[PDB]
Design an enzyme around this catalytic site. Sequence first.
Site, PDB file in Angstrom:
ATOM      1  N   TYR A 188     -11.906  -1.497  -5.969  1.00  0.00           N
ATOM      2  CA  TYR A 188     -12.796  -1.411  -4.806  1.00  0.00           C
ATOM      3  C   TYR A 188     -14.540  -1.244  -4.954  1.00  0.00           C
ATOM      4  O   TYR A 188     -15.029  -0.754  -4.089  1.00  0.00           O
ATOM      5  CB  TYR A 188     -12.441  -0.473  -3.596  1.00  0.00           C
ATOM      6  CG  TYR A 188     -11.092  -0.877  -2.957  1.00  0.00           C
ATOM      7  CD1 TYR A 188     -10.788  -1.951  -2.183  1.00  0.00           C
ATOM      8  CD2 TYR A 188     -10.038   0.027  -3.526  1.00  0.00           C
ATOM      9  CE1 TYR A 188      -9.460  -2.184  -1.641  1.00  0.00           C
ATOM     10  CE2 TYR A 188      -8.763  -0.215  -2.944  1.00  0.00           C
ATOM     11  CZ  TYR A 188      -8.500  -1.300  -2.197  1.00  0.00           C
ATOM     12  OH  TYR A 188      -7.124  -1.500  -1.339  1.00  0.00           O
ATOM     13  N   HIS A 242      -2.502  -5.464   1.192  1.00  0.00           N
ATOM     14  CA  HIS A 242      -3.755  -5.988   0.995  1.00  0.00           C
ATOM     15  C   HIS A 242      -3.395  -7.462   0.693  1.00  0.00           C
ATOM     16  O   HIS A 242      -2.396  -7.691  -0.115  1.00  0.00           O
ATOM     17  CB  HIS A 242      -4.288  -5.205  -0.086  1.00  0.00           C
ATOM     18  CG  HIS A 242      -5.572  -5.905  -0.784  1.00  0.00           C
ATOM     19  ND1 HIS A 242      -6.673  -5.918  -0.503  1.00  0.00           N
ATOM     20  CD2 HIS A 242      -5.430  -7.070  -1.684  1.00  0.00           C
ATOM     21  CE1 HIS A 242      -7.555  -6.637  -1.179  1.00  0.00           C
ATOM     22  NE2 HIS A 242      -6.661  -7.337  -1.810  1.00  0.00           N
ATOM     23  N   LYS A 258       0.931  -1.172  -0.068  1.00  0.00           N
ATOM     24  CA  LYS A 258       0.076  -0.049  -0.210  1.00  0.00           C
ATOM     25  C   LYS A 258       0.946   1.261  -0.029  1.00  0.00           C
ATOM     26  O   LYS A 258       2.104   1.088   0.290  1.00  0.00           O
ATOM     27  CB  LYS A 258      -0.833  -0.109   1.336  1.00  0.00           C
ATOM     28  CG  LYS A 258      -2.115  -0.945   0.866  1.00  0.00           C
ATOM     29  CD  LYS A 258      -2.919  -1.160   2.182  1.00  0.00           C
ATOM     30  CE  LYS A 258      -4.137  -2.010   1.729  1.00  0.00           C
ATOM     31  NZ  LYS A 258      -5.187  -1.800   2.861  1.00  0.00           N
ATOM     32  N   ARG A 271      -2.952 -14.505   3.889  1.00  0.00           N
ATOM     33  CA  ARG A 271      -3.449 -13.853   5.178  1.00  0.00           C
ATOM     34  C   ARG A 271      -2.854 -14.151   6.403  1.00  0.00           C
ATOM     35  O   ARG A 271      -2.735 -13.168   7.283  1.00  0.00           O
ATOM     36  CB  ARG A 271      -4.629 -14.501   5.105  1.00  0.00           C
ATOM     37  CG  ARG A 271      -5.965 -13.419   5.154  1.00  0.00           C
ATOM     38  CD  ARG A 271      -6.978 -14.077   4.281  1.00  0.00           C
ATOM     39  NE  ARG A 271      -8.256 -13.296   4.623  1.00  0.00           N
ATOM     40  CZ  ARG A 271      -8.542 -11.887   4.248  1.00  0.00           C
ATOM     41  NH1 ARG A 271      -7.421 -11.118   3.614  1.00  0.00           N
ATOM     42  NH2 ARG A 271      -9.614 -11.377   4.618  1.00  0.00           N
ATOM     43  N   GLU A 303      -9.541 -10.053  -8.581  1.00  0.00           N
ATOM     44  CA  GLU A 303      -8.558  -9.158  -7.889  1.00  0.00           C
ATOM     45  C   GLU A 303      -7.327  -9.201  -9.333  1.00  0.00           C
ATOM     46  O   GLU A 303      -6.919  -8.212  -9.698  1.00  0.00           O
ATOM     47  CB  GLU A 303      -8.402  -9.159  -6.743  1.00  0.00           C
ATOM     48  CG  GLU A 303      -9.373  -8.711  -5.862  1.00  0.00           C
ATOM     49  CD  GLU A 303      -8.841  -8.710  -4.358  1.00  0.00           C
ATOM     50  OE1 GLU A 303      -7.674  -9.192  -4.068  1.00  0.00           O
ATOM     51  OE2 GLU A 303      -9.575  -8.259  -3.492  1.00  0.00           O
ATOM     52  N   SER A 315     -12.525 -14.065  -4.906  1.00  0.00           N
ATOM     53  CA  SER A 315     -11.896 -12.499  -5.087  1.00  0.00           C
ATOM     54  C   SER A 315     -10.624 -12.319  -5.673  1.00  0.00           C
ATOM     55  O   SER A 315     -10.439 -11.576  -6.448  1.00  0.00           O
ATOM     56  CB  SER A 315     -12.206 -11.985  -3.621  1.00  0.00           C
ATOM     57  OG  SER A 315     -11.122 -11.999  -2.910  1.00  0.00           O
ATOM     58  N   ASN A 329      -2.839   0.079   6.964  1.00  0.00           N
ATOM     59  CA  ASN A 329      -2.255  -1.205   7.402  1.00  0.00           C
ATOM     60  C   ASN A 329      -1.421  -1.919   6.257  1.00  0.00           C
ATOM     61  O   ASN A 329      -1.384  -3.280   6.290  1.00  0.00           O
ATOM     62  CB  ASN A 329      -3.532  -1.895   7.651  1.00  0.00           C
ATOM     63  CG  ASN A 329      -4.453  -2.267   6.442  1.00  0.00           C
ATOM     64  OD1 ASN A 329      -4.156  -1.690   5.269  1.00  0.00           O
ATOM     65  ND2 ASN A 329      -5.391  -3.258   6.604  1.00  0.00           N
ATOM     66  N   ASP A 350      -9.118   4.042 -11.217  1.00  0.00           N
ATOM     67  CA  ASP A 350      -8.443   2.940 -10.975  1.00  0.00           C
ATOM     68  C   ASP A 350      -8.880   2.155  -9.737  1.00  0.00           C
ATOM     69  O   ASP A 350      -9.302   0.886  -9.637  1.00  0.00           O
ATOM     70  CB  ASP A 350      -6.975   2.915 -11.255  1.00  0.00           C
ATOM     71  CG  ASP A 350      -6.384   3.402 -12.512  1.00  0.00           C
ATOM     72  OD1 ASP A 350      -7.326   3.390 -13.210  1.00  0.00           O
ATOM     73  OD2 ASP A 350      -5.375   3.701 -12.706  1.00  0.00           O
TER      74      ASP A 350
HETATM   75 MG   LIG Z   1      -7.843   2.042 -15.391  1.00  0.00          MG
END
Ligand SMILES: [Mg+2]
Lengths: 143, 143, 143, 143
Positions: C51, C117, C11, C87, C128, C124, C114, C46
């Site tokens: 999300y 991700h 992140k 995870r 993703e 998912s 945090n 984006d």
């Molecule tokens: Mg785009």
Amino acid sequence: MAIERTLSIVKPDAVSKNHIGEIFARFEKAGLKIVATKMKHLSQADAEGFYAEHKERGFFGDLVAFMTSGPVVVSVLEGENAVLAHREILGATNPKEAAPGTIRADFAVSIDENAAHGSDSVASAEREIAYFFADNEICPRTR
Amino acid sequence: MAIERTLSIVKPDAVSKNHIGEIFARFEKAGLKIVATKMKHLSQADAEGFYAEHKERGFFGDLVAFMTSGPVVVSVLEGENAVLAHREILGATNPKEAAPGTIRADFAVSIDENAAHGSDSVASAEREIAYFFADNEICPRTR
Amino acid sequence: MAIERTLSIVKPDAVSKNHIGEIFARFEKAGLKIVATKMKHLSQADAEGFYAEHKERGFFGDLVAFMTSGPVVVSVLEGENAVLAHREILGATNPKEAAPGTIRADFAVSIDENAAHGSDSVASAEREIAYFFADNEICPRTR
Amino acid sequence: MAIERTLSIVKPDAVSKNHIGEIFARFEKAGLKIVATKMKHLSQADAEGFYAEHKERGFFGDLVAFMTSGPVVVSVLEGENAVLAHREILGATNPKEAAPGTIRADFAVSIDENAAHGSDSVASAEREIAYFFADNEICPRTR
Ligand SMILES: [Mg+2]
Ligand SMILES: [Mg+2]
Ligand SMILES: [Mg+2]
Ligand SMILES: [Mg+2]
Ligand SMILES: [Mg+2]
């Protein structure tokens, strides 16, 4: 009916003879929208991956060889009934069997050098689009 | 004399009105080769970076607004005298003075929405190409 | 004990404090293989597309604002049990309740910031991964 | 003092042994910032273009093969004296000659398979970054 997406490829024959615009124009004229596109020169590996479902078929070698002989344009075309409408203006795989004013009629020389590719179904389209494009690259229309 | 490369952008007006093919076919017919191409939706930062030279000019804000209002097609055109060749195919920046059969004459509504961009010089062409395209991304013709 | 693929994001916080390597080293130590990676500065579009499931939540604005405040690193990690393995390494979303030596415990400043991700499941993960990566961009191991 | 940019490649050996993170960590530990990165599998053409300058040389095929043997990670590193500074961390080109604590001394097998590449100079870093990255694709730090 439902707005769909399909993969187009302008194959190395049509690129080398500079028919990219003419071919794009046919699609647009029929009401397909170009929502992604990029020119790539496929590596051996890139071609083999795209066509991995034909890996054990006899035709794979020459297909792969042609599709790596020069740069191609890959594009996502969006529109009502896109998978089929695209196939309609692409015409039959053989240019000799292709209707007048289809892409194969007008730009293809042979079965192997047949100018363009379209996905054969909605399930193939989904896989073929995902092979070449991240969803982040697809550019919905906003004006 | 030499083979040059130049940057083309199909602007969001011409994308939105499905003129990509027609414009492309004009370049190809005039002997320019498309050696790279991608569609993108420019962010504010992408557009301000490209147009940084005009950052203190009255039109900057409106240009950046227009160029981020929907997707574009960025391309590298290659050919003899390509920079100026591309410029004469495009015609005058203002579509009211553009010659017939030019892209601005045929596809531009106004000086603000003028369909397409061409690099103005060799030095500018190299920077604008590099802005959008790694050298590894440009596809020389083989075959 | 099935080989899976899952999305990782380093992140903007962890990028800005130069913890990319350290983070990547944790994944590689735990057996996961990096098979695609790229640094990107997300546009608001984006980030809103990635999300999209949260678009009606009151926190969407903050999430998107943080995920576009600086560059990120997006990656595809592959390995046995990849989703849940990833995870356990990340730890709880909230840093204050993540086990020592997890990514959140050592690199996260807060719940919002945090550090990284990870996909929450196989469905998912597929969505993703496809959001950020063409299948053609993923690089399976060859030695 | 002058902030510079340099090219890092993590070579197919260091990738396959899952050392990417460990190597990136050393760059960041030294105060260089990763401002672009991607994983790629270079084709023969991609590598021939990167190493074009050595093409008449007799190590060229050996270099092209090793660099196409598996995926690599290409990065742009930014910092004070980045070119020389990066060169110090990599250590001597031959890992038998390299100082301890350098990535070649700690990850490289042999001069064929020496784990990482680095730009040799400022003029060459700029050509080499431009080969792999468009200017727009490099991500300055904004937070
Ligand atoms: Mg785009
Ligand atoms: Mg045949
Ligand atoms: Mg908050
Ligand atoms: Mg590939
Ligand atoms: Mg930029």
